[model samples]
Target: SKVYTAKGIRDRRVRLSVSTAIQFYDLQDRLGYDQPSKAIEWLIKAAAAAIDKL
Candidate 1:
């Protein structure tokens, strides 16, 4: 089960999703784009929330 515990697998997937989201957000929130830091911040928060020891 080490390969696929609910939390483990789910968290891994969540982390991947967060990574993908961050990459796209970075593409849009480029230099001089002036977007709020929240895009990145929220993506990180999303990963954190997924792996968090709830």
Candidate 2:
């Protein structure tokens, strides 16, 4: 598994809804990632992998 980090130049700024933001922070804490953005990246990659199986 790749270790996700908040390194490099970030080019995007995303706005999350209140509930989504709460869930995001929950995932970040649960996964023990240094940044919430890393948790979002991990979710995107995991979703992509699951989509590939469809």
Candidate 3:
């Protein structure tokens, strides 16, 4: 709740858990690209896991 109304500013990036997956992808990409798609796919899986917990 505080995040959405921080200083009269709404942080869209943190609105959804996808932002977390994207962040994970970005970090993994910087590490290597052996299979970028696969890596991102895995990150998406992590997102799903988080969502399921919710």
Candidate 4:
């Protein structure tokens, strides 16, 4: 059986420096992730977790 559900996903535009953009793509490759967004999302969550311990 299957049920329909909304992900509630939304898009936003963010500006990044060339160096940072390159870094994200590089990280994606290193992590074997298809999207740079996955790298950035992981970084955000990792940073938040680190911050909470401070």
Top candidate, metric TM-score: 2
Ranking by TM-score: 2, 4, 3, 1
All candidates' TM-scores? 0.28, 0.63, 0.32, 0.56
Candidate 3 yields a Cα-based lDDT of 0.66
Model 3 TM-score relative to the real fold: 0.32
lDDT of 2 at 14: 72
Residue-level lDDT tens digits of model 3 in 1-54:
335464686643334388877886687777676766566666678689687988
Clashes within 3 Å, all models in order: 0, 0, 0, 0
Task: Give the runs in model 1 whose Cα sits over 4 Å from its true position.
Answer: 1-23, 26-36, 49-54
What lDDT does candidate 2 reach at residue 6? Answer: 78
- Cα lDDT of model 1 by residue, 1-54, tens digit: 125675665332223377777776675566334554555555577679666876
Total backbone clashes of model 4? Answer: 0
lDDT of 2 at 22: 91
Q: List residue ranges in candidate 3 displaced over 4 A.
A: 1-26, 29-33, 50-54
RMSD of 4: 6.8
Instruction: Give the TM-score (vs. native) of candidate 4.
Output: 0.56
